[PDB]
């Protein structure tokens, strides 16, 4: 019933591609950019086009998009034949790849049913493992047993096929034709592993993973251990796999412009980054400034520097310092939490694949997050191997894996949130931080800020804390409630993240005196100076001011003096 519907949908798709030219001068009326896109790729001949689904959803009141959207695998050669006919008529070794992107709905891996078999789908998640690219047979040149005649056979992406009848009536046999590789176009075929994101896992469930196939020039773009979003077709494999065609490295203005014009935003921000915790404004300040970094870019030579903020919390037992740990992971999308004591895995472990007996690098705790916060609870009960792997991952913003003869290093950006405890639990003011923390100097270094919490019997704030604890124990109390929700705070974090501010001369002249004042207390070296420099642009982004004044760096100087 689709044999006469395929030519009509081919005519509709080529009418959509033929009736839309470019009239985009002076930001006037809109019309699609496809003919100039074909005219641009005429020189390079890659034929790996990108067609927006939002731009295709306006024709036939969306009904053309809804009919293509369910019968995509049954309409795909008609669409590529219509694309071939329009490039054969508008332009004079021929492979084609049509990619669809920007779907209005983002589907998870747990909502995949069998009602969407063959339809298009948007799958978001994180890549766990990757497979080295291999040639895809696609179409082969079979030769006959007696005719010696060439036949161009088209595979169906299932398994090694074979024709049935010879086209030339010189023979009618069904014996074994022989394969030929000259006249058989080959496309790189990669198989990667996608898995469920850490913020959308059900309670007690397992993060179920799946294998997704990818062809064309969409390969060698997906970086391992990065949140990715694919758009493709659900194809069954003799298992329900996936075929992707589009790759992207993923991971209101009336409210944002209203929130950047006032003057008391930062004071509600330090008490709204953790509304369940009573007290501890310094820890909330470091947690709020530890979500967004800055000035890492490129050194005047050619090496990247550590532009991130490392935050470590210490103190006595039974405090609310783990509550922040439970908040970050419940609010930040780029946040991976580990227990620490029960943990190579931290620094991205190595696992083998039997095809070539080849290694792949699993991110684990260390490389799972991108421009985010990796939070490690119980940092002092870990071993020596994972802590020197953390130190090897921290001196240079990269991680190295040396296994089976191959050495591979990669750029992983993370902000360590380390929760530690003393050797005896109770924090004594008798000695230094080094003998009480019980860890070596190097792993103690490259940490921008330390938060020490000590408790005692001070009734005036203690009765308020106990009343807040017993008032919290009810069905959704308003006591916890912040001055504004997280709804505008997420887009504010993203808007401050894409800002990129810079320092001045007065700030540098006050910074040299501040480094002398910090070194007069004396360990303190260049790393703490780099930590307060990185916290300066983070507080500049949080207060949304471009050129920084030294008065906002004075609060960071007071924060360093408070620690």
């Amino acid at each position: 019933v689709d044999d006469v519907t395929g030519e009509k949908v081919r005519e509709a798709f080529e009418q959509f591609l033929e009736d839309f030219s470019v009239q985009s001068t002076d930001t006037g009326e809109v019309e699609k950019v496809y003919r100039a896109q074909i005219e641009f790729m005429k020189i390079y001949d890659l034929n790996t086009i990108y067609i927006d689904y939002q731009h295709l959803s306006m024709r036939e009141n969306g009904a053309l998009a809804m009919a293509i959207s369910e019968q995509y695998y049954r309409f795909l050669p008609f669409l590529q034949k219509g694309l071939r006919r329009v490039v054969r008529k508008y332009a004079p070794e021929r492979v084609f790849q049509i990619s669809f992107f920007n779907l209005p709905t983002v589907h998870r891996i747990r909502d995949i049913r069998s009602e969407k078999i063959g339809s298009l789908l948007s799958i978001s998640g994180t890549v766990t493992r990757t497979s080295e690219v291999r040639p895809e047979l696609y179409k082969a040149s079979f030769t006959c047993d007696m005719c010696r005649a060439i036949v161009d056979n088209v595979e169906q992406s299932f398994k090694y096929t074979e024709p049935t009848f010879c086209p030339n009536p010189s023979c009618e046999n069904r014996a074994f034709w022989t394969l030929n590789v000259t006249r058989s176009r080959f496309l790189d075929w990669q198989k990667v592993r996608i898995q469920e994101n850490a913020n959308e896992i059900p309670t007690g469930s397992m993060p179920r993973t799946l294998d997704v196939i990818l062809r064309g020039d969409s390969v060698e773009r997906a970086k391992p251990g990065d949140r990715c979003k694919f758009t493709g077709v659900e194809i069954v494999v003799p298992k329900i796999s996936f075929l992707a065609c589009h790759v992207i490295s993923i991971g209101e203005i009336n409210e944002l412009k209203e929130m950047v014009k006032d003057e008391h935003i930062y004071d509600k921000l330090v008490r709204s980054i953790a509304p369940a915790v009573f007290g501890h404004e310094a820890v909330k300040k470091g947690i709020l400034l530890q979500m967004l970094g800055g000035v890492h870019k490129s050194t005047v030579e050619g090496i990247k520097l550590r532009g991130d903020i490392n935050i470590c919390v210490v103190g006595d037992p039974s405090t609310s310092k783990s509550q922040f740990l439970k908040y970050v992971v419940g609010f930040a999308p780029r946040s991976v939490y580990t227990s620490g004591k029960a943990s190579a895995g931290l620094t991205a472990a190595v696992v083998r694949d039997e095809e070539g007996g080849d290694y792949t690098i699993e991110a684990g705790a260390l490389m799972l997050a991108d421009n985010g916060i990796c939070c490690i609870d119980e940092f002092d009960k870990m071993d020596i191997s994972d802590q020197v792997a953390i130190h090897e991952a921290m001196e240079q913003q990269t991680i190295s894996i040396a296994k089976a003869g191959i050495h591979a290093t990669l750029n992983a950006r993370t902000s360590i949130l380390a929760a530690a405890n003393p050797v005896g639990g109770r924090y004594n003011r008798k000695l230094s931080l080094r003998g009480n923390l019980n860890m070596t100097a190097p792993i103690m270094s490259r940490f921008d800020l330390f938060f020490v919490i000590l408790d005692d019997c001070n009734e005036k704030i203690d009765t308020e804390l106990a009343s807040h604890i017993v008032d919290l124990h009810m069905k959704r109390d308003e006591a916890i409630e912040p001055p504004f929700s997280a709804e505008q705070l997420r887009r504010y974090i993203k808007y401050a993240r894409t800002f990129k501010p810079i320092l001045t001369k007065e700030a540098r002249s006050y910074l040299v005196e501040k480094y002398k004042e910090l070194r007069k207390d004396d360990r303190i070296t260049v790393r703490q100076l780099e930590s307060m420099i990185r916290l300066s642009e983070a507080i500049a982004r949080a207060n949304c001011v471009d050129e920084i004044t030294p008065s906002f760096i004075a609060e960071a100087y007071d924060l360093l003096r408070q620690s």
């Binding site: 695998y73 169906q156 397992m206 179920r208 439970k326 227990s339 004591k341």
Partner: protein
């Protein structure tokens, strides 16, 4: 009876349609199918009471699931195309066989030639085998916990996964398995309720229970009162999206030896329906390529109590998992193949 109930429910529904004035609702219910999920049946003793006279009967299992295989597509229907003339034929299943037609039959392609099976255009029933750790209300002496391989089908896939206390019911088949008709992810007489209300109005009930919990031992008012209200539990309240709190107390006993300590440690194992006398661990199962969980101890008792003796002689490496379950009730594994925090 399920096959004839599907016809009778459609017949009584169209009898309800014809009794009242309505719009065009008969255009979709004439071809729609409706089923029945019976679950209110009595308990059984797991797989141990499942004798061979109970094959193809309804059965119910209460326990926890440990491993969920990825849904596998089964082909309810299938497409066939004559590669030389392109006429399509849809075939359906019948007791597990798919007749493959040999030659074309249309009038445009009358010639005898070989068809081809296409699947990327055929609907598939989803099938999935799920590992289940069973635990009945009563267990015989010498019995070990069992791992039953149950199998779910369409419209029920990805609804049951590892980590929950699940009541399940279906048809026991035969290697043996259970074909699930229903899952239950959520969970006395009047004279007994009147006796409960009459015994709850007395003043000495607060000590009466502490005396009736163990009459073979001594007083132990604070200890017996604590284990009484420990098994009473408390109040477990949560938020809508990001908060949870459970009424719970973790108790420790220390002091002079040779008294009723082990007695209690056994008595409570004889009271709760879930508990081990001692954590679990995630595993990337390679056969199904999936993150299954495989356990006992505390993991099994994600409900009830869990008894540990000789706390001082226990190692320091395994104290870090109980450091999280003290007030956080969570498992955070960060190892090779798995970085997962879960309920415990």
């Amino acid at each position: 009876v399920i096959s004839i109930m599907d016809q009778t429910i459609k017949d009584c529904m169209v009898s309800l349609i014809v009794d009242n004035n309505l719009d065009y609702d008969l255009d979709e219910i004439e071809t729609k199918f409706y089923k029945v999920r019976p679950y209110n049946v009595g308990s059984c003793k797991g797989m141990r009471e499942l004798n061979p006279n109970d094959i193809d009967k309804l059965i119910n299992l209460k326990g926890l699931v440990l491993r969920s295989t990825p849904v596998i597509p089964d082909m309810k229907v299938a497409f066939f195309k004559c590669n030389v003339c392109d006429h399509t034929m849809a075939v359906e299943i019948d007791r597990g066989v798919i007749q493959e037609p040999a030659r074309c039959e249309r009038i445009d392609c009358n010639e005898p030639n070989s068809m081809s099976l296409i699947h990327n255009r055929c609907s598939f029933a989803d099938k999935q085998v799920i590992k289940l750790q069973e635990t009945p209300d009563f267990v015989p002496d010498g019995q070990t916990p069992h791992s039953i391989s149950l199998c779910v089908y369409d419209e029920l896939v990805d609804s049951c996964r590892a980590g929950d206390r699940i009541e399940v019911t279906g048809t026991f088949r035969s290697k043996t398995y259970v074909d699930v008709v229903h899952v239950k992810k959520v969970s006395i007489t009047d004279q007994d309720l009147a006796k409960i209300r009459e015994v709850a109005a007395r003043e000495d009930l607060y000590s009466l229970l502490a005396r009736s919990i163990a009459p073979s031992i001594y007083e132990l008012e604070d200890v017996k009162k604590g284990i009484l209200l420990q098994l009473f539990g408390g109040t477990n309240k949560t938020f809508t999206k990001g908060g949870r709190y459970r009424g719970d107390i973790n108790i420790l006993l220390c002091g002079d030896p040779s008294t009723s300590k082990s007695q209690i440690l056994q008595y409570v194992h004889k009271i709760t329906p879930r508990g081990v006398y001692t954590t679990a661990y995630i595993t990337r199962d390679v056969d199904t390529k999936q993150l299954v969980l495989e356990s006992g101890a505390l993991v099994l008792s994600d409900g009830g109590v869990c008894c540990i003796d000789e706390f001082d002689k226990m190692s320091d490496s395994t104290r870090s998992v109980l450091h999280e379950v003290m007030e956080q009730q969570t498992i955070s594994i960060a190892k090779a193949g798995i970085i997962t925090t879960l309920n415990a």
